[PDB]
Symmetry: D2
């Protein structure tokens, strides 16, 4: 939790996310996707468990990125749900949902699901 | 987008979420779950597309809730990814990921997936 | 389980699925999608719990459809995971994963997730 | 497709799956889980695209396992949706949904989601 999360993280696609974990469970930062209809940095906000279990369990967390910034607007938003595992080789393992705004007829195909693993080393 | 999202919403489980959508894509509010290891209100933060398509597409959005408040700490976080559809009968259709902090051995079973539909009427 | 599952079911998109649940947990039948790159009937195969709990729990089941038949080949496959709830108003509630064959570069966006509810009445 | 899929595969949890891919898109075999409420082998059935794209795209496939055999009955079923990528280092990348039979009140938490990567080497 807290201290260990703040920083720059890289995932397997080459995306970068910089976050600051605040004392009372808030996560704020920017995300830069190495793939998709995206360019530059996007604002992200989220929450994490600031009083995790004192056993070897991970710290649960999640964040959202709406893919609109001053350069592009992909009319979609991605939410990452996962846990932070600290130690020598810290990582954040997540599963994500990317929903695009669609008309009612295409709603059935509006959401993509995947998984990303973030490390402090890339 | 914006104006239409702010308010109190209810989903099919009986949970309540009150949010304020700010001018530049931010969502802030509280969530009260009618089920699970939860009690009272939890803080939520998210993002939405503040410049959605002008055709009949929904507005993409997402938010996160870390299930820790002054009464309980379920060491888990839920992220809702979906879209807002306005009109006579406005609704927010979503899919969610609920991840619990686990030890590495139980990580494979750390995440639940489901779907919630929110209406302004309950 | 068994007897109660065999038949024709319809979901909210208007798709039809006809299945036969065999004595030892097998499900065989055809699926006709009302949406997507599909035409006519596709072969489906799956499994279900043929000795479900005797309390009011649902019967877990799942099936797969590869979207290739004599008319079309969408190079994708959908798997539905859910449970059968019997009674006056029987239904099968499911969540599904639709994966398309992609090149390694586009693998991150290869899978769609959604949910379908099947009834014996349409 | 076809020839390349038949065989024994191992995933990162240490589970084993042996399948035979038949000429017209059928997959039959057994699965042995290294984790969960499981013991020994379970029957699996599925489908795959037997006429995949001739570019470097993966072959889409999916299969289901109902966790009931002669030793145990976990009243749950798992469906794996993914694609087969052949070559020197062949693998099947998947995302899965594990649904447990529950009472209507607990249905919201009936499904787990995860991802498994299978190799011919373990
Ligand atoms: O195409 C879009 O809608 C915008 C870019 C989406 C990028 C995705 S979301 C999950 C995955 N992980 C990343 O770092 N990028 C992709
Ligand atoms: O059990 C927990 O970890 C805390 C409560 C979780 C409640 C869930 S998250 C999705 C679903 N929708 C709701 O409104 N509540 C449940
Ligand atoms: O587009 C394709 O790849 C083939 C058709 C896919 C139809 C989907 S799978 C889930 C959803 N439920 C249905 O009945 N049809 C759509
Ligand atoms: O606990 C159960 O219901 C039976 C065992 C479930 C094992 C799961 S399903 C996905 C994951 N991959 C595996 O090989 N095993 C676990």
């Amino acid at each position: 939790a807290e201290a260990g999360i703040t920083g720059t993280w890289y995932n397997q696609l080459g995306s970068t996310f910089i976050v600051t974990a605040g004392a009372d469970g808030a996560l704020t930062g920017t995300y830069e996707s190495a793939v998709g209809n995206a360019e530059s940095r996007y604002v992200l906000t989220g929450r994490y468990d600031s009083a995790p279990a004192t056993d070897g369990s991970g710290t649960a967390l999640g964040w959202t990125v709406a893919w609109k910034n001053n350069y592009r607007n992909a009319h979609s938003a991605t939410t990452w749900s996962g846990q932070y595992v600290g130690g020598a080789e810290a990582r954040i393992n997540t599963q994500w949902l990317l929903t695009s705004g669609t008309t009612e007829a295409n709603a059935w195909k509006s959401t993509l699901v995947g998984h990303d693993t973030f490390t402090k080393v890339k």
